[PDB]
């Protein structure tokens, strides 16, 4: 499936959803400016409501390391 | 109402509290040097306990745009 | 300190052991409560930069505090070397200058008071530390339902003394926040005095309320 | 203070660092309880106006107190310039005069004791502050049902010492209010002594009541 | 105090500011507990009558105490003028004499120790005040059911030290009342020692009882 | 200490009775809490090895502490005699040398500062004692659920100051353990600051949390 | 104390008023807790027998203690007159000798240190008093079920310091009773260390137990 | 009754308490200098808690006419 | 209606009653000395019993700003 | 019985307690200087709480005749 | 009636009984030494048991001012 | 998981806790000088209360082999 | 058993406790100087509370014969 | 009867038994060495169990004054 | 029986089991290196589970004196 379709399941650990997201992003083959937008925006918007709340609290500049570090307890 | 006693409601969106706060800070007769301190300190101090927990993590330099961005849907 | 010898020339007289111990008591036991600045400013009367560095050797060990203090001293020494192109910043901070240079500077005509100047830079760093170690914001200070207004005023001014606020903001806090955070019975009296009230009027009105 | 040099001439000897720290302890820790006036009056023994101004630099920071103090000093300096048309008010307050003028005045024959005079104006301002910071009116002081009469007498006189009352009003308060506000068991003894009783008689009668 | 100058002649050296403050602490904070007399007697070492009057200026303000003190001093000054027809009573009390007369008297051969004599009259007045401010009669001092005998002995002797009793009556109180008012468990041990027991024997027997 | 005589030669001036009493208060009443090292280092200003041995005569009586101290001094005296083949170890420790040798060494050009060196060996032994008497490991220090972060930081740094850890381990403890052992509400704020936070940032963020 | 005059001759300098007051605080407020002996030994640095008698004038008033002290001094003065057939016992106790004799003796070559000797007899009497006023036997000192081993060790050694035991008995008490009276959880650790353990090992093992 | 123990009744009009107070201050044998202090301090101190709350707001300079005017119908 | 008829309703905020009073006073066209008396006297006497109590506690010299500031909580 | 433990009974006439007290003070082996102190201080200290309240009002100079006269029928 | 007959009624304020006593004493016209005895002795003996107790606690030297001052609370 | 929060289970064999601890100490990014302190102090501090009671008796010099040998079957 | 923990039984005759105590003091490996202190201090300290109350009255000089004689049948 | 027969009755005050004992001893007319033994030994052995316990706690050297002083409370 | 057969009974004091063990070891007559192994190893392995736990806590170097001292409470 395309990257737009990848969502976090209601009880899925964030690291597994991130792995699915980036595996799909690698197959999606969009140009790097679009990949920047997708990894900033879709990855947050398609998270669980709790995890999405944690991620939005980081603001827009968050790196993937920070996003995963924040979500370990979810 | 006095700016000192504007407090974010237990379920009030932070943008609504910001609107109440700054609409009242225009009424306050204190000097601009005092209003600067009010914007810096009262806005965080009088936030909702959840939202206040978000805001204090942003540090003392945080802009109002950053504060509002962090507290979306809190 | 500086003392005139029997030859009439000015000479160093060391900051005494039990004065240093009184400063150690202030640093160790009062936990950078704001009276640390009056007590530093008192115990360092007449102190040369060598004496002041001797007093800072007990702030060392409070590694966070001593970091804030050293960086503030270095900042002011740089500001000195910027403003003034005679002692350089490290000489007035007494790290490079000799004791005899410091005493000379302090006793020339006019005096070059490297002691009192460096003591101001230290007091500015102690202010930063006293702010850091403040237990509360001035906004957190409220009068208890049975607390005497005198004791609340003491807590309020002690906290206001531990705050970054400019004198204009401190004036507004004194006029407005002190009333706002009083307990409702006492606050009723303070409101009835109106906005012009001095602290003397506020306290004599609320006495035993 | 003033000290005779080896040349026999009078010279300044600065108020020592640990004396100033003892005054800082009094200002900061005793919250203008009335013993601040005895302790000021003791620590300022022999103080020139320069020494007294050095001691007031720690009342600064208690912005309300220091305001009452400065305005009372300025009031007395104006009263001096009014009564006496030699030191002017700002010279005896040591803001304009030189240290050598102050020591000269204090050591001429007869002495012009600018130190002890200015120290009276400061003690008068400290009295105003001690009244402001009083936690209670003398009327609020009552003996508890199990409180020793000695402890109630101590609280009563401490408050009476913190009050504006003239000596005639203080005499009446001592004779009448002290009895009125005793607890009923103890008050019965005090009433039975009649109106002429001294405090010695009142205390020895109520001892352990 | 008196100090030998570089010329070898005896001269006045004033009772220091922080010694006076230590006496103010004793007067204000220890509420005429009996250690006020040891502490007065210590702080007044070498005091001339001018120094002693300087120390009494802080008992002033305790209007009852200072009345007892002044009247006892006047009584002893009258007794002096009665017994001795050189210093008169007001000269040895230092109200009329000059400082140079007081130092002369204290340093003639033999000395006329107006300081130590007047200091005895002051200690006699302080004794009267310490009795007045005693919280209890010696008869009220009892050992609590769980109180260590050491602490009861301390309370007992502190009160006995605050009492008018002659040394014969104090001896009887020590021998008899101290046993009588012990708690019954401890009292049983003290009774078993019989009447001859010293305090050392009583305390070592009751240790941890 | 060392004082220049009127002949200009350096001579011994004994560590004063009330300075020694201030050290006795530190040894007896503060139970080798870490401020004993600042207070020792202050009270021993200018101390010769004879003065330092006079100060150690009150650590004697704390038989465990004095054993650790003597063995550490002997260890450093042996290390001195090893490194340097002029004072021997027992001379710089002042057990064999004369007072005049110690003052000579301390006042030659360059100085041979047997006082400040031996004072470092004593401070090293006092460090060992302060570690022994530490009530807790740094790992045991946790913030209470209602404890102010300022008070927890004070307890944490006081314990960290009482620990054997090298500066690298102390840095890691400051960065990591201080956050780990905060209470969960406060810990949430500290986690949100990320790993780079200074203590100033941590405390201002958690202020009143 | 003894001070070299400007003429180079040794002369008396009186034990200062505020040193005597510090001894009065020790006698009155610390109730012959064992730190009274370190504090006496510190405050009496350089004391002549006249100075020591001046210090004993505040143990007078503690009639039991002063009796034990006088009789111990008289016992040692008799032992002196027995051993040595120059100062007699009453001269070294300073009751019969002149001040100039005492200073002569203390400053001849070799010195006849009547001060330090009489100070040992006083410390021996203070030891007897400290034993009498001990609140507990060393056998009564037990660790509470939640008491830190550090605090129990402090209580234990403080009591052991207040006991008649020879050093051999104190060594056995340290090795054996300290373990025996620990609480069972802590005692289990101390037993597991075996009999050879030093106090350092015992405390570091039981730290936070 | 002693002036020290004249207290305003829980429902007593302030004018009635003033009449009781000043009628008794004429009986008091104390000097005029003491009576001045009594008029200044006891009258407020012994007022009814509601009325006392009104009176303390008037400050130390307040005349008896002002005090009575403020407390009408309290 | 004439100014004498304007009264505060039992639950009316004081600011609304003041507005009605001064609107009527402007239409009443009495001379300024009478307006001074009316604004001092009728405005208090025609208030609610609670609000009238608060206003009488201010004494006779109170300005309209002070009167309205006092009554905000009623 | 020891003089220190002679106490007036809860209903005992003061004259009966005085008789018990002085009859026992003749037995006490203490010196006359101690007996003087006992007559002055114990007699009041050990009186019945009502009678003791009467006696302490008489002051320290009171004679036994005065003390007995005051306590008739107490 | 004669002075000997005047007694305090069981609930009579002492001042009223004193007034009756001295009005009768003025009519009795006995010589002054007898009046001294009567005013010292009958006036106490004919009081109520409570008031008589209070009066006896004053001892024999009490003036009429002291007697009345003592009995105000009875 | 952070090495600071690895704690021996209430019934966990000490060898299993040692395996968890040292496997995590390899993950910790702290310097070797800090890891030395961790091996010395955390391993004892975080042991099970029974096992911790055994380990503290071994003294500060104890090797891991000695610690494991002492805690067999604890 | 350790001499420190030999204690007289709640009903044990003092002679039986003395036999237990001294039979154990022969086992103790401590020096004679320590055993002297034990005979002087532990024997009293560890006595039964009744018997201990007897023994402490005898003073510090008491011989074992005197101690046993005093405690017969206690 | 002879001295050997004199015993303390189960509720008899010790002073009465002592009086009976010495009255009998005076009539018994035994030589003084025997009287010494009797007054030391029979006088204790023939006391009540409680009083005999108190007396034995005094040891063998007790004088009659001490014995009677000890037994006053029995 | 041979040394291998000697075991501690479920309630047997360790000293009795040690006595049985060494009595058997003396009869077993194995060479000293084997005796060293047996006294280190069998003596522990054949103890009760509790006593065996205490003994293993001592580690391998324990002397017989230490082993018996450790087990006195079992």
Residue numbers in the entry:
A (entry chain C), B (entry chain B), H (entry chain B), I (entry chain C), J (entry chain B), K (entry chain C), ...: 148 to 221
C (entry chain A), D (entry chain A), E (entry chain A), F (entry chain A), G (entry chain A): 1 to 85, 98 to 221
What wording appears in the published article?
pmcThe mature HIV-1 capsid is a conical, fullerene shell that encompasses the viral genome. It is constructed of a lattice of approximately 200 capsid protein (CA) hexamers incorporating CA pentamers at 12 highly curved vertices. The surface of the conical capsid is dense in protein-binding sites that mediate interactions with host machinery necessary for transport of the capsid through the cytoplasm into the nucleus.
Comparison of the pentamer and hexamer CANTD structures revealed structural differences at the base of helices 3 and 4 and the intervening helix 3/4 loop, and includes the formation of an additional 310 helical turn at the base of helix 3 (residues 58 to 61) in the pentamer. This results in V59 moving toward the core of the CANTD helical bundle, inducing a different conformation of M66. Additionally, a new interface forms between helix 1 of adjacent monomers, including a hydrogen bond between T19 and the εN of R18 that may further fix the position of the R18 ring, and a salt bridge between K30 and E29. Within the central pore of the pentamer, we observe two densities, which we interpret as IP6 molecules: one IP6 sits above, and engages with, the R18 ring, while the other is coordinated by the K25 ring in a fashion that is reminiscent of previously reported hexameric crystal structures. Here, a largely hydrophobic interface forms centered around Y169, L211, and M215 in the CACTD, and A64, M144, and Y145 in the CANTD. R173 in the CACTD, which in the hexamer forms a hydrogen bond with the backbone of hexamer–pentamer switch residues N57 and V59 in the adjacent CANTD, instead interacts with E28 in the pentamer.
